[PDB]
Each structure stands twice: as C-alpha cells, then as structure tokens.
Design a protein around this ligand. Structure first.
Ligand SMILES: CC(C)CCC[C@@H](C)[C@H]1CC[C@H]2[C@@H]3CC=C4C[C@@H](OC(=O)CCC(=O)O)CC[C@]4(C)[C@H]3CC[C@]12C
Ligand SMILES: CC(C)CCC[C@@H](C)[C@H]1CC[C@H]2[C@@H]3CC=C4C[C@@H](OC(=O)CCC(=O)O)CC[C@]4(C)[C@H]3CC[C@]12C
Ligand SMILES: CC(C)CCC[C@@H](C)[C@H]1CC[C@H]2[C@@H]3CC=C4C[C@@H](OC(=O)CCC(=O)O)CC[C@]4(C)[C@H]3CC[C@]12C
Ligand SMILES: CC(C)CCC[C@@H](C)[C@H]1CC[C@H]2[C@@H]3CC=C4C[C@@H](OC(=O)CCC(=O)O)CC[C@]4(C)[C@H]3CC[C@]12C
Ligand SMILES: CC(C)CCC[C@@H](C)[C@H]1CC[C@H]2[C@@H]3CC=C4C[C@@H](O)CC[C@]4(C)[C@H]3CC[C@]12C
Ligand SMILES: CC(C)CCC[C@@H](C)[C@H]1CC[C@H]2[C@@H]3CC=C4C[C@@H](O)CC[C@]4(C)[C@H]3CC[C@]12C
Ligand SMILES: CC(C)CCC[C@@H](C)[C@H]1CC[C@H]2[C@@H]3CC=C4C[C@@H](O)CC[C@]4(C)[C@H]3CC[C@]12C
Length: 1149
C-alpha cells in the first residue's frame, strides 16, 4: 500500500493535493483497512522506539555514573529538540504575522482618512498595503495547516515511541514487579496516560509565544493610543483568575452531582435486573418514587452547574466589548479624540491578544502539567526491577525419554517447582542447570489474539504434515468442525469463541508443534472429559514425548430536533429565545458601529467640540445592553435545554417502567442501562453547552457577513457561489471523514488486546525464546493504528485548507473592493468592515466544527426519544374495581388457556382445562421448559394469555394488573433482596407495624440473626444480599409472603442447592404456616410435593393427569409412576409409602 505523500511536491503537499483519490473513493463507497496508506519509514514503531530507547539508555548510564536520578524528560528533549526547533521558527513567523497585519489595516484606513480623488500615488501605496495584508492572510491561512500537521506528527511519534518502550519494559518485568503492579496499571498508562503526548506538542510552543506576543501587542498599543491601553490590559489580565475560579467552582459542583448520578444509575440497574420480581410484587410505584427523588436531587445541582456555565459563556462573549469600552472610555476622558485609524487598530490588536491570553496560554499550561505528570508515571514504570538475563532443598535431575510425574495436593509446590525450572523462582540457594529448548504448559489455558492456526504456530513457519500430525494427535478435529472456518477461525480475547478445553487443547498442540528439547506439562487433563484426556495422555505423550525431556504435573433528521425543542418549552418561549439572540448580536455589532459613527462625526468637524456626555452615555448603554442580552440568552438556552432533558428522562422512565416483560427479554440489561447512563448523561451536561456554543459562533459569523454586505452591497454576489461551494465541500468531506473516524477507533483496540494477552501469558512467552516475535507483532499492531491516525490528521488538514481558502477569499474581496469603490466609502465604514473580516478567521472553522459536534451528539436524543414511546401493557387500574375481599376462597378455574411468550412464537400451553378448589395443595411436575415455567406467567398475566381464567367468578383479563398481582403471593426460584433497610425490603409501602414485622421475622427465625447488627433493622445491604445466605433470602421471601397474607400462594423451584437443614426448615414452615391458604407448588423434586392433594402432569405443554398422587401411582401406565420409577427403587418405594400415608390420613380418618 504505497503512500502518495512520499512522492508529492511542495505545492502538492501545502494544499494536500495527494489525498484526492481517497476522498473520491470514499464518496463512491465505504472505506476499509485495505484503503489506507502504509506509514512512512520514519513513522514506524520500531524505528522510533529504538531511537528513544537508545537515548534513554544513554541518559540512564550517565545518571548512574553521576549518582543521581535519571530524567525521561531530559532524554525526550535530547531526542526531539532538533525536530522541534523548526516548528518554533515557523510559530515565531506566524505570531509575527498575526501581530503585524493590524499595522497595514491601519495604513489602509489612514489612506481612506486623507482621501483625494485626483492623487494616484496614494492609491498605488494603498494597493501595495492591501497586497501585503493579503500576503499575511495567506501565510496565516495556507501554510499553517502543513505546520500543524507536522506539529501533530511530532506528538504522534512521541506517543508511539513511548508505547514501544513501555511494551518492551513490560515484557521483561520481574515476578516481584508483577506482584507489586497489576495487569490493569500497565493497560491504563498506555490507554490514557500516553495520549497526553498527542496534545502537549500542539501548545508546547505557546509558553514562550504567549508572553512575547502579549509584550509586543502592549508595545504597539502604547505606540498607537498611549497610556489608555493599560485599562484594557488590566481587564485582560484579570480575565485569567476569573476563569481559574470558574473552573475550580465547576469542578466542585460536578463532583457533587456525580454522587447522585451514581446512586441513580445503581438503582436503575437494580430495578432493570429485578424487573420480573418487581412486576410480580407490584413495587414499581415505590421504585418510581425513589428514582424520582434521586433524579430531582441530581437535577438541582445540574441546574446550578448549567447556570455557572452560561455565565462563563456570557463572560467570554462580552469580554471584548468590556475591554474596548474601558480602553476608549479612559482614552477619551484623558483628553484625546477618536479616529477610525486608531480605534480599529486597537480593536484588532486587543482581539488577537485576547484570544492568545484566554485560550492558548491556559491550554498550554494545563496540557504541559498533564504531560509532565504522565512522564513522571512512565519514568516510574520504566525503573522497576527486571529479570536478570540468562548467562525446600529440592535436588533432582531428569533425563531425556523419562516421563517424570509429580502427584500431590493443591498447594504442594508443583507450580512453584515448574516456575523454578523455567527460571521464574530466583534461587536463594542451590543451583539449577537447564539447557536446551523448553516447552511449558500453564495451568490456566492462554490464547492470544489471532487465529487458531496462528496460536498453534506461535510465530513458527507452517508445515502441512507436522500440523496435520499434531492436530490428529490432539484430537482437535471435532473442535475445528465446531467452528465455521475450522482451523482459521479468529479467537477473541480470553477465547470467547471457544471453551476452556478447546483452549487447553490448542495450547498443548502449540507446545507439541514447537518441538522443544524439554517438555513441561501442568494440569493438562483436569478441565477436559475422560476419553479426550486419555487419548491425549497416551498418543501425544507416551509416544510423541518418549524422546524428549518430560516433567509432568497430574491430578488424576428534523423530527428529532423538533421533538427535542418541543419537550423543553412552548413555542412562544422559542420565539422569545430567537428574539433574545438576535438582539444580543445586534447590540454587539451596534457598539462597534457606534464607534465608527463617532469617528465619522468627529472627522466631519470644523473650535467646535463633541457632546462627550451624549456619546459616552450611548456607548455605555450599548455595552450594558450587549452584556445583559448575552447573559439572558445563555441562561434561557441552558434552562430550556435542561428542562427538555428532564422531561425526556421522566417520560422515558415512566414508559420503561410499564413496558412488558417481553421487551426486557429481548433487550440485554447493558443495552437498557446505556440509555440511562450515557445518553441522558450527554443530554444533561454536554448537548446544551455544545448547542449554545454553536449558536453563539454562528450568529457571530452571520454578524460579520452582515456588516461586510451592509458596507458594500456588491459583496452579496460572490457570496452565493461561496456558500454553494461550502455546502458541497462539507458534504464531500463528511462522506469520508465519518468513515475514517471509525477506522482509527476499531484499529486501536488490538493494541490493548495484545498487551493484555502478553501480560497474562507472560510466563508462557518467556518459556520459549520467542519474545522478539511478540515485539514485532506489537509493532505491526501499532503500525496498523498509526496508519489510520495519519489519515485522521491529513483529511482534517485537507478540509481546513479549503475552508481557509474560502475565508481568505472573502477577506481579500472585502479588502480590495473597499479600495475599488473608495469614492463612496469612508474611514469608519472601511475600518469596521475590514476589522470584522479580519476577525472572521478561526471563528468560521470553530462554527463548522461545533455544527459537526452537534450533529454527532443528536444520536443520544434520537435514542432517548426512541425509548420514550415503547409498547405498553394493560393498565394497572381499570374502571370496575373488584370487591375489597375478592380473594374470598381462592378457587381457580382454567378454561381453554393457550399461552405464548410472544405473538407468532412457538406455543407453550395447549388448551389447559382444570379446576383448583379452595384450601387445597397442588403440585406441578413435568419437563424443564415444557410448560412448567409458563403457568405463573399465565396466572400473573405477564404476557396476555388467550382464553378465560376465573378467580372467584371474576375474569383475570377483566381486572387491572395491579388489582390482580397484589392478591396472590409468589415465592421465586432465586430470592432477591433490594438495596435498603430490612423494613423497606419487608414492607416498601409501610402498610404494617414494627410489632408485625418482628413477629414475621420471629416466625421465619431471622429475628435473632438480625438483632445483632449495629442497626436494629435499618442496616444497609449489598447487591441482592451478597452478605446473606441463599436460605436467608428464601426465609426473607417467606416472611414477605406471611406479611402479605393472601389467600392464593405459588412457589416456584423452592430448593435448588441449599443446605438440608434450611431446606427442612423452609418446608416445615411452609407446611405449618399456610394451612388455610390455597398453595400451588412447581417443584423439580418429588419429595416436597409428595403430600400435595393433587398433582398436575404436563407433557410438552399438554395437561395429562389431574388426580390424587396415590391414584396416579396406582396406575403403572401413568406418567407420574414412570417419573417416580426413573428416580430409583428404594426412594420410589419411600415416596409411594408417603403418598399412601397421606391418602389414608386425609381421605379416610
Ligand atoms: C508576514 C510578514 C513577515 C511578511 C510581509 C512583509 C513585511 C515584512 C512588511 C514589513 C514592512 C513592509 C513594507 C513597509 C512599507 C512599504 C512601502 C509601500 O509603498 C511603496 O513603496 C510604494 C509602492 C508602489 O508604488 O507600488 C509599499 C509596501 C512596503 C514596501 C511594505 C512591504 C511589506 C513589508 C516589508
Ligand atoms: C518570555 C518567555 C521566555 C517566558 C517563558 C515562560 C516561563 C517562564 C514559564 C511559563 C509557563 C511555565 C511552565 C508552566 C507549567 C509547568 C509544569 C510544572 O511542572 C512541575 O514540575 C510541577 C508538577 C505539575 O505540573 O503538576 C512546572 C514547570 C512548567 C513546565 C513551567 C516552566 C516555566 C514556564 C514555561
Ligand atoms: C436581522 C434583524 C431582524 C435584526 C434587527 C433589525 C436590525 C437589522 C436593525 C434594527 C435597528 C437598526 C439600526 C437603526 C438605525 C441605524 C442608523 C444608521 O445610521 C446611518 O448610517 C445614518 C445616520 C443617522 O441615522 O442619522 C445606520 C443603520 C442603523 C444603525 C440600523 C442598523 C440596522 C438595525 C440594527
Ligand atoms: C433586558 C435583558 C435582561 C433581557 C430580559 C430577559 C428576561 C426577562 C429573561 C430572559 C432570560 C430569563 C432567565 C432564563 C433562565 C433563568 C433560570 C431559571 O432557573 C433557575 O434559576 C432555577 C429555577 C428553579 O429551580 O425552579 C429561572 C428563570 C430564569 C432566571 C429566567 C428569568 C427571566 C429572564 C432573565
Ligand atoms: C513603528 C511602526 C512603523 C511599526 C514597526 C514594526 C514593528 C513594531 C514590528 C516589526 C517586527 C515585529 C516583531 C516580529 C516578531 C515578533 C515575535 C512574535 O512572537 C511576537 C511579535 C513580534 C515581537 C513582532 C512585534 C512587532 C514588530 C517589532
Ligand atoms: C439596543 C439595540 C438592540 C437597538 C437600539 C440601538 C440604539 C441604542 C442606537 C442604534 C441606532 C442609534 C441612532 C442612530 C442615528 C441617530 C441619528 C442622530 O441624529 C440622533 C441619534 C440617533 C437616533 C441614534 C440614537 C441611538 C440609536 C437608536
Ligand atoms: C445575527 C443576525 C440574526 C442579526 C445581525 C444583524 C447585524 C449584525 C446587522 C444587520 C443590519 C446591519 C447594519 C445595516 C446598515 C448599516 C449602515 C452602514 O453604513 C454601516 C453598517 C450598518 C450599521 C450595518 C451594521 C450591521 C447590522 C446591524
């Protein structure tokens, strides 16, 4: 993949003319990894890493010789100073041009001030000054992009070399070092701490170009207006601590909102995870109340932070107005007069120095601080003790052809012995002599990123016959056939596409194919079956390894915007907001126009004087109006958008609380929580800020264009082509930038994956001498990502060059049409128009970038609105409320009941017809998934069933959901305890008394177990009772059932893996607590339901038998007797005897 940048001229490199085919291809179709350009030889990972490693080694040697600490910063400087000096030269030139061009602007205005229609030498000099101004504009607009690309490439090179050296160090760390650190510390310092180097170089040269530019601008201002510049300079200086305090207060406000956002997200996770149980118990109202309280508490602080951010933006908007106001107020109060040549030179110089002071210097300070911190961290990492290069009283030897075996309990030291053999255990005393290639198998299987064939090869050359022999010996044919691509299938991190046995088999195959002199195996057959383990142990060891040293360890659009804005406030508020923004921009421009009018009226004079009171009063009024309107616009925009976010969140949460269980079955929990964690997070604190910034910048651009058009009406003619070209160019760019932005995102993850895999299997990597091959693989992975970072930089520069070309064409048109039509213009108009044209720079590009960011961020709004209108089940309440004691008896009649999880899916129940008399015990038996689990769903109307179900001669489908689910108790398979007090977990609605709760706890025998915590019952618990036992949770649910005290009770899978003592306790309490309540039990074991009055028999969703268990046991052809006989003989006899005893005791007293 040749890189056309290698064969480009200087003219083709300044304008990025070599990137056109890529944009054409991206416009035609989509871009893949085959469409990228290979990196230049000077940008390869190995080259940069080796250079920086040599410099760092020299620095470390010098520091050790001089007996002091080494400096990674000093090494980096000594490496990159030569290449970073020339960028300093060009930034010096750029800042010089920025400072210089106001002088020629003022000279053009001065020509306009002494207009003589007959003189031509003055006109020629004015044309020359305009030409020099255009040259400065072209220097600032054209070459800056190549300069910026080189500046960013320097930081990219620094980051790549950093990553290479970090990986090289991490590949040889000692065991004590690995014990001190973790596998996450190495990953994070390369995933987030090395990215500071991409941004440190952009602002690195402003630390000396900020103060110098400020001093030069102050000197020029003193030359122009005099001592009056000190007021503007004082305001500009004061602007820095104000911003520092704003930041220090916003951070404090945000750290207080985070503590509520986290609690809200945790509660959301809990309710989403336990949605079936919450719907079963009808507690959605309580959870809604809790979430509403938390959301309101978070929203208050979000409102405070939004107000602070709006004030910050208003201050940024009106700072220039305030500076110019104070400067010229003192200028005219000291006794001088106002002229257009000086006013609009001071304005331009103040604008330049204001951008420099308020943005570039603080950004440089912050990024340099972060970079220094990161360099300190990396220097700390690069100095841990490393393994020395190979130059109780264990003493044994092993010869080739000997299958040594070690058998012992866990913790004996077999793994430690193998590590000592490999050299991992440092010999405190004794001597270990190991010579030759060593093959090692770790206890835990390890598979690195790549394919199965690549994993087996481990970098070795592929051989067909050897690979086939190894595969056949390892019995991997079935595992290969299990995959789609066979042996070429890509295995993900931790083998997500395979199993543990498959990973172990692949590792064994790789070890065998490596063909080492010494073979070491650790726990090979523990995680696999019997036949495969025997086949391995025989035909891959006793024959293959019979000639090798062996040691073995064995154990055997537009609607989106419309809805987003309509959710915020009524359309009248939108009209008022539009008017407010328009008035703010109008006043902002009218202040400058008033300065121009003052200059013109002073010039057209005569001694007569000007009304200072009048002019200064109108000036101050315009400034005050500008400031107030900016503040109002910012506050109103923030309030409206935050209210929109709040309303959207409320509607979405209310809709998802009522969505049926099918929606939660179809969607994963993480996907559900993403729209409450990330999308709402955007809508709450980033979209309003981005929207307000974009609106501000767009209105400023419109104001500049409007001033230019108003001064010279003919400028509206080239504007139509300049806008059409801009629209088409933006479409053309965005058709490829969005494809490039994802390549650099999906190519970054393999680096971290390889890092994690190499860290995990570091012992296996070092067992063989194949570590340079892993270094080369890491180099290739890093090259594949620097291959897309290159395009990310170059396409952005490509777009910026053409945007700057359009802006510079506009500036040139203004500056030359002013002189062409000089017979009708005057100094004030010319100065105003030309100064605004000069300010258009940077503003245009920032507006475009902010528009792109807003369009990117609207996806969260689209997702939130999509979840806002989900499906809704039957309402919780109906018009006809039931009698207060509708559970009179509990007789339940099923008549022609067909139930399916989803419409159009396979059926589960087929024509169920049965009757359940009050106060009887019913057992349910059958196959797993054969309709046993759908009975509770049909009875609780989780999915609306087909047919008629009668409870006390009332139809279930005729009464509301909350008026039905609340009157029948449920005991789930796995009980869940919700976060909160025991009082909350036993009675969320507070419908009972403390004495009743204590009585229930005594009945379930947790009262004594509870009354020893620091709190009586209000102790906070962990997620789903992590500090409690399964039996404890079951008894808590039993206490819930007793407290509810409903006539109908249903148990589903009571005991699965609980201790027999708690099982017997639960069974006896269930039997002796609910004598007068109808109980339906769905049990997977026949011991618990042997004494039931009747047993339901289900066969593939068909009701087969409905009679007494003894009667069914009498018939041998009955399904119940067959399932009994499957259990055994003695247990079957005991169950039959128990059924006979129950039948005799009940029916025949
Ligand atoms: C980005 C910057 C560093 C490059 C732009 C050039 C500048 C270094 C400036 C500084 C002083 C300027 C000069 C100052 C005064 C004049 C006199 C002026 O008037 C004439 O000599 C008459 C011209 C004519 O008759 O056409 C022409 C422009 C010129 C040479 C200027 C040309 C541009 C100069 C060299
Ligand atoms: C007219 C020109 C030549 C003046 C140049 C400006 C320097 C006198 C100052 C301005 C900003 C300063 C930097 C601001 C921030 C930092 C980070 C800071 O790093 C630390 O050692 C502190 C740890 C941390 O940053 O958390 C101190 C040095 C340094 C590079 C400073 C070095 C001296 C600098 C370049
Ligand atoms: C885009 C729209 C909806 C914004 C609001 C309307 C503006 C386009 C109007 C409202 C008031 C207008 C101003 C009202 C009066 C004048 C005086 C006028 O002064 C002169 O040049 C003549 C001298 C004189 O007025 O005696 C210049 C235009 C200006 C500033 C107008 C500029 C255009 C303004 C700001
Ligand atoms: C002459 C200039 C100042 C324009 C006049 C416009 C004002 C009449 C409007 C425009 C912006 C409005 C403000 C926009 C945003 C806010 C924040 C908003 O939220 C809060 O302060 C919290 C309210 C709560 O928590 O209930 C309350 C209304 C308020 C002050 C508005 C009050 C009325 C304002 C100042
Ligand atoms: C006196 C009138 C005629 C104008 C004379 C031009 C003078 C003032 C110009 C010419 C060269 C200019 C300097 C060129 C280079 C730089 C370095 C830059 O980082 C800050 C601005 C600064 C320091 C400029 C300040 C202004 C400057 C000294
Ligand atoms: C506050 C913004 C939104 C709009 C109001 C702008 C006001 C403050 C400005 C803009 C245009 C100005 C007017 C422009 C021209 C003249 C003609 C002169 O013989 C008397 C003053 C008068 C009439 C000015 C008074 C102040 C003025 C009305
Ligand atoms: C951003 C949008 C919504 C509103 C911005 C409108 C502003 C920037 C425009 C609209 C009308 C314009 C004015 C129209 C007419 C003149 C007279 C001319 O001799 C000097 C400029 C001046 C005074 C213009 C200054 C800029 C102006 C006030």
């Amino acid at each position: 993949k040749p890189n056309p940048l290698q064969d480009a001229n200087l003219c083709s490199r300044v304008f990025f003319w070599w990137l056109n085919p890529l944009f054409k291809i991206g416009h035609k179709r989509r871009l893949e990894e085959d469409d990228m350009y290979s990196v230049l030889p000077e940008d390869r990972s190995q080259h940069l890493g080796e250079e920086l490693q040599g410099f760092w080694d020299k620095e470390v040697l010098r520091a050790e010789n001089d007996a002091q600490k080494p400096s990674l910063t000093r090494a980096i400087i000594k490496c990159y100073w030569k290449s970073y000096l020339v960028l300093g030269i060009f930034t010096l030139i750029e800042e010089s041009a920025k400072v210089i061009q106001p002088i020629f602007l003022g000279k053009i205005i001065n020509y306009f001030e002494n207009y003589d229609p007959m003189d031509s030498v003055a006109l020629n000099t004015a044309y020359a000054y305009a030409t020099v101004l255009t040259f400065c504009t072209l220097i600032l607009a054209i070459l800056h992009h190549l300069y910026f690309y080189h500046v960013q490439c320097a930081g990219m090179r620094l980051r790549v070399a950093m990553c290479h050296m970090i990986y090289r160090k991490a590949l040889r760390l000692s065991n004590m070092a690995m014990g001190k650190t973790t596998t996450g510390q190495i990953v994070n310092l390369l995933s987030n701490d090395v990215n500071k180097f991409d941004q440190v170089t952009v602002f690195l040269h402003f630390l000396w170009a900020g103060p110098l530019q400020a001093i030069a601008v102050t000197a020029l201002l003193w030359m122009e207006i005099g001592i009056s510049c000190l007021a503007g300079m004082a305001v500009l200086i004061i602007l820095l601590p104000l911003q520092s305090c704003f930041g220090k207060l916003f951070s404090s406000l945000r750290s207080k909102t985070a503590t509520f956002t986290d609690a809200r997200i945790r509660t959301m996770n809990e309710v989403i995870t336990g949605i079936r149980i919450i719907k079963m118990y009808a507690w959605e109202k309580s959870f809604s109340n809790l979430i509403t309280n938390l959301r309101k508490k978070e929203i208050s602080k979000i409102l405070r932070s939004s107000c602070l951010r709006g004030m910050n933006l208003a201050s940024f908007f009106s700072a220039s107005k305030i500076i110019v106001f104070v400067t010229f107020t003192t200028y005219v109060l000291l006794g001088s007069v106002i002229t257009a040549s000086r006013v609009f030179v001071a304005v331009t110089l103040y604008g330049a120095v204001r951008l420099t002071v308020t943005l570039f210097f603080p950004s440089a300070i912050e990024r340099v601080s972060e970079a220094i911190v990161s360099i300190r961290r990396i220097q700390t990492f690069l100095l841990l003790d490393e393994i020395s290069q190979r130059n109780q009283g264990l003493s044994f030897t092993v010869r080739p052809g000997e299958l040594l075996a070690v058998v012992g309990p866990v913790g004996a030291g077999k793994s430690s012995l193998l590590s000592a053999v490999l050299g991992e255990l440092a010999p405190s005393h004794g001597l270990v002599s190991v010579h030759g290639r060593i093959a090692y198998v770790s206890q835990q299987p390890w598979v690195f990123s790549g394919t199965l064939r690549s994993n087996i090869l481990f970098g070795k050359k592929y051989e067909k016959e050897r690979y086939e022999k190894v595969i056949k010996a390892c019995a991997l044919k079935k595992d290969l056939q299990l995959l789609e691509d066979g042996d070429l299938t890509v295995i993900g991190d931790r083998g997500t596409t395979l199993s543990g046995g498959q990973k172990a088999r692949v590792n064994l195959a790789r070890a065998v194919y490596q063909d080492a002199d010494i073979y070491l195996l650790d726990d090979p057959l523990s995680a696999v079956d019997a036949e495969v383990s025997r086949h391995l142990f025989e035909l891959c060891i006793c024959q293959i390894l019979h000639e090798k040293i062996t040691i073995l360890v064995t154990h055997q659009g537009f609607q989106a915007y419309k809805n987003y804005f309509r959710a915020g406030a009524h359309w009248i508020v939108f009209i008022f907001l539009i008017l407010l923004n328009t008035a703010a921009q109008v006043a902002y421009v009218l202040q400058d126009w008033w300065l121009s009018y003052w200059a013109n009226k002073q010039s057209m004079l005569n001694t007569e004087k000007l009304d200072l009171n009048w002019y200064l009063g109108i000036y101050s009024g315009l400034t005050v109006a500008t400031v107030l309107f900016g503040i109002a616009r910012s506050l109103l925009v923030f309030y409206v958008l935050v209210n929109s976010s709040q309303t959207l969140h409320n509607k979405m949460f209310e809709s998802i609380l009522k969505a049926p269980v099918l929606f939660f079955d179809r969607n994963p929990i993480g996907r559900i929580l993403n729209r409450f964690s990330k999308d709402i997070g955007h809508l709450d604190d980033l979209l309003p800020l981005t929207f307000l910034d974009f609106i501000q910048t767009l209105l400023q651009v419109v104001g500049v264009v409007s001033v230019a058009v108003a001064v010279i009406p003919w400028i509206a003619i080239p504007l139509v082509p300049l806008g059409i070209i801009f629209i088409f160019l933006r479409r053309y760019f965005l058709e490829t930038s969005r494809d490039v932005k994802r390549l650099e995102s999906t190519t970054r993850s393999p680096v971290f994956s390889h890092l994690s895999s190499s860290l995990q299997g570091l012992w296996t990597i070092r067992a063989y001498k194949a570590e340079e091959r892993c270094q080369e693989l890491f180099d290739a992975h890093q090259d594949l990502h620097s291959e897309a970072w290159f395009l990310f930089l170059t396409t952005s520069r490509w777009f910026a060059v053409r945007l700057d070309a359009i802006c510079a064409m506009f500036v040139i048109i203004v500056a030359f049409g002013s002189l062409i039509l000089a017979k009708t213009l005057d100094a004030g108009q010319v100065g105003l128009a030309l100064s605004y044209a000069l300010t258009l720079m940077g503003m245009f590009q920032w507006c475009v970038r902010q528009s792109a960011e807003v369009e990117n961020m609207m996806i969260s709004v689209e997702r939130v609105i999509e979840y806002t209108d989900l499906e809704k089940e039957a309402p919780w309440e109906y018009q006809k409320r039931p009698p207060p004691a509708w559970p009179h008896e509990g007789v339940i009649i099923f008549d022609n009941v067909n139930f399916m999880y989803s419409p159009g899916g396979p059926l589960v129940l087929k024509h169920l017809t049965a009757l359940i008399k009050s106060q009887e015990k019913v057992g349910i038996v059958g196959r797993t998934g054969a309709g046993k689990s759908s009975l509770i769903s049909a009875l609780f109307r989780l999915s609306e069933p087909e047919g008629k179900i009668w409870i006390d001669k009332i139809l279930t489908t005729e009464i509301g959901l909350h008026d039905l689910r609340k009157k029948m108790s449920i005991i789930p398979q796995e009980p869940v305890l919700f976060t909160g007090t025991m009082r909350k977990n036993l009675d969320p609605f507070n419908e009972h008394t403390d004495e009743e709760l204590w009585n229930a706890l005594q009945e379930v025998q947790l009262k004594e177990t509870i009354e020893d915590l620091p709190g009586k019952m209000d102790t906070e618990l962990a997620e789903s009772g992590s500090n409690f036992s399964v039996g404890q949770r079951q008894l808590v649910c039993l206490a819930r059932a007793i407290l509810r005290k409903n006539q109908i009770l249903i148990i589903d899978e009571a005991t699965a893996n609980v201790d027999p003592r708690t099982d017997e306790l639960i069974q006896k309490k269930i039997r002796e607590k609910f004598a007068h309540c109808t109980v339906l039990t769905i049990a997977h074991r026949l011991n618990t339901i042997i004494d039931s009055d009747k047993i339901m028999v289900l066969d593939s969703g068909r009701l087969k038998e409905y009679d007494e268990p003894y009667v069914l046991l009498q018939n041998k052809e009955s399904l119940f007797y067959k399932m009994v006989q499957q259990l055994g003989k003695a247990e079957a006899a005991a169950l039959t005897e128990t059924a006979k005893q129950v039948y005799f005791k009940r029916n025949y007293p």
